[PDB]
Amino acid sequence: CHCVILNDGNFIPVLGFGTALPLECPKSKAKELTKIAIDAGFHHFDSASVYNTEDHVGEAIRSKIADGTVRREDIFYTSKVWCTSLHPELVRASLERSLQKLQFDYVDLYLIHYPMALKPGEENFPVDEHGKLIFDRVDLCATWEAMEKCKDAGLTKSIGVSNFNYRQLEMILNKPGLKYKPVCNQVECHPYLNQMKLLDFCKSKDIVLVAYGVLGTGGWVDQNSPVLLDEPVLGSMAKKYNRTPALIALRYQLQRGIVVLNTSLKEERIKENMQVFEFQLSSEDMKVLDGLNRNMRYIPAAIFKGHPNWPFLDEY
Amino acid sequence: CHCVILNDGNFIPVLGFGTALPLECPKSKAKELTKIAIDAGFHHFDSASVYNTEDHVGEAIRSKIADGTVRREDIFYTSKVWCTSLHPELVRASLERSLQKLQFDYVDLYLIHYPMALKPGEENFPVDEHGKLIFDRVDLCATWEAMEKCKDAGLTKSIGVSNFNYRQLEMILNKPGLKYKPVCNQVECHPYLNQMKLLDFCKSKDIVLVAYGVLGTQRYGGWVDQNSPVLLDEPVLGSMAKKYNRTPALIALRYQLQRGIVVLNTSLKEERIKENMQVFEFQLSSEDMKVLDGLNRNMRYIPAAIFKGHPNWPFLDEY
């Protein structure tokens, strides 16, 4: 493995495969993609209870274990508790359900998906008659204590968070009687939103930053206007190193000590990910990439914008 | 043709097929889709110079004219001049280039795509080293006069605008020496953004409101936002669909037709393409129309965000 140590003693592969699927795709597509990713060399798989793809991803993994491609111990599986189960007593319940769907005995990492609670229930997006989310309030420190207990019960080897801004991380870190610090903070990160300040903070607290939406992500204008991968600097550097604009973006994060999660529906693209270990960017080129930062948040989770705990209002 | 009259005497089919394709589709996809629509009964096709599918669309259309399925005069084709060619002297050149690709003698409708100009050039989204769109200053009244000439030259039968707000329409309507009022204003419109005020304004000025994004849109590619409830998930639409034994989509389409709006819709699915024609097989009661009116929440799914900093960005005013 091309791994990095977590503050709790566990190791996580620096390259992971995201299992979230496009709205149009049959959830079963996750199974095929997971198998392809495994054959391509991926050992780290990122999922979440809300993606409703865990049963298929679990089947893919158990199938590659059964034919001897990999062993459970060599796989790093991550799940996340959704907004509707942040209530302390619902945390463990959701994790156990995921393990049931996966037919696993444990997950390697369990994260709080967002620092925002929503009305408990089967619906992942509970809304009123006006289509507005029914927010709920919870003590994130209580939710955290429940995460700690899951780790102690052996249901998850490590625990961390996702989409937490620095102050929210602080709430957990300064929590009285804290037992386990989150091992990571999974957030959107790429050349247009390099998360420099948040990264420096996490590193200062021995927390690993895990990036999703590393290559970026409606109407014709909004769908055809230039996006991250259209960046001329990446295209130029890609030709300079004879790789792809995507590989430049992926490599950029690795050289910053960031764990990267990537996804694709195409086998060739999934396989190309492994090239991120085949080359290196020069200090000067790393500095050039640092200059692309333009605070462009592609995954704002707009529907939550009115939530008291929306993490993206603060600078970082 | 289920057609309605325009303020210039010409008629437009009340249902049209948009020819804009998802960035992940070979531009040729537009040819097969257009032929399918034509067989399904579509006569109205909405395109734009920027979509860069005009050649493929013209191929399909001419193909159906050749085999006798339709006549050129039975087809209503719309094109639009992009932000980079709004300068009075570039308006006609853009149209002639589109006709060349289509291999058409004329287009039935020609529109100003957005009331915002961008740096001239082949590049459609010119940006600086900071990734910011390079805006340009233009006189829309002068642009409009260039559109009027196109109509006088017979290159387009009618002229209109798209994504203009009420004051921007006024700018044109109150123009000294105005020869032709725009026949329409093509804007985003659906139950969550019914454009009541802009509609009432257009009606008062004899302007037809043409709607796109009629079934909602999901701009954000992020999982959470793409997986949160969408317009078609609306319980009122699902409940009403059951009442009339139709689909939530058909209810949303019929809603617009009864308001005097011309609807544009698209789909990569042949089955959904056909389904559209069902909108003409039923009618919504006046009571239910009122019910649908209550669904408005000023939810604009197509904000053209990249343009948000432009002086003429049309979505700032109330309407």
Curated annotation (Swiss-Prot), chain A:
Binding positions for substrate per the UniProt entry: K27, H113
Positions annotated to bind NADP(+): 16-20, 46, 162-163, 186, 212-217, 263-273
GO BP annotation list: steroid biosynthetic process; steroid metabolic process
GO terms, molecular function: 17-beta-hydroxysteroid dehydrogenase (NADP+) activity; 5-alpha-androstane-3-beta,17-beta-diol dehydrogenase (NADP+) activity; aldo-keto reductase (NADPH) activity; androsterone dehydrogenase [NAD(P)+] activity; lithocholic acid binding; NADP+ binding; NADPH binding; steroid binding
Major place of residence: cytoplasm
Domain of life: Eukaryota
Listed GO CC annotations: cytoplasm
Keywords: Cytoplasm, Lipid metabolism, NADP, Oxidoreductase, Steroid metabolism
CDD domains named among the record's database cross-references: AKR_AKR1C1-35
TM segment ranges: none
Tissue: Detected in kidney and brain.
Root EC class: oxidoreductase
Active site location: Y51
Consequence when changing K27A: No effect on affinity for androstenedione. Slight increase of catalytic activity
Regulation (activators, inhibitors): Inhibited by high concentrations of substrate.
SUPFAM superfamilies in UniProt: NAD(P)-linked oxidoreductase
Annotated EC: 1.1.1.-, 1.1.1.209
Effect on the protein upon substituting A20Y: Reduces enzyme activity and affinity for substrate. Alters the stereospecificity, so that androstenedione is converted to testosterone
Recorded catalytic activity of this chain's protein: androsterone + NADP(+) = 5alpha-androstan-3,17-dione + NADPH + H(+); androsterone + NAD(+) = 5alpha-androstan-3,17-dione + NADH + H(+)
Family matches, as PANTHER family: ALDO/KETO REDUCTASE
Subunit relationships: Monomer.
Function: NADP-dependent 17-alpha-hydroxysteroid dehydrogenase that converts 5-alpha-androstane-3,17-dione into androsterone. Has lower 3-alpha-hydroxysteroid dehydrogenase activity. Has broad substrate specificity and acts on various 17-alpha-hydroxysteroids, 17-ketosteroids, 3-alpha hydroxysteroids and 3-ketosteroids. Reduction of keto groups is strictly stereoselective. Reduction of 17-ketosteroids yields only 17-alpha-hydroxysteroids. Likewise, reduction of 3-ketosteroids yields only 3-alpha-hydroxysteroids.
Family classification: Belongs to the aldo/keto reductase family.
Protein name: Aldo-keto reductase family 1 member C21
Taxonomic source organism: Mus musculus
Gene: Akr1c21
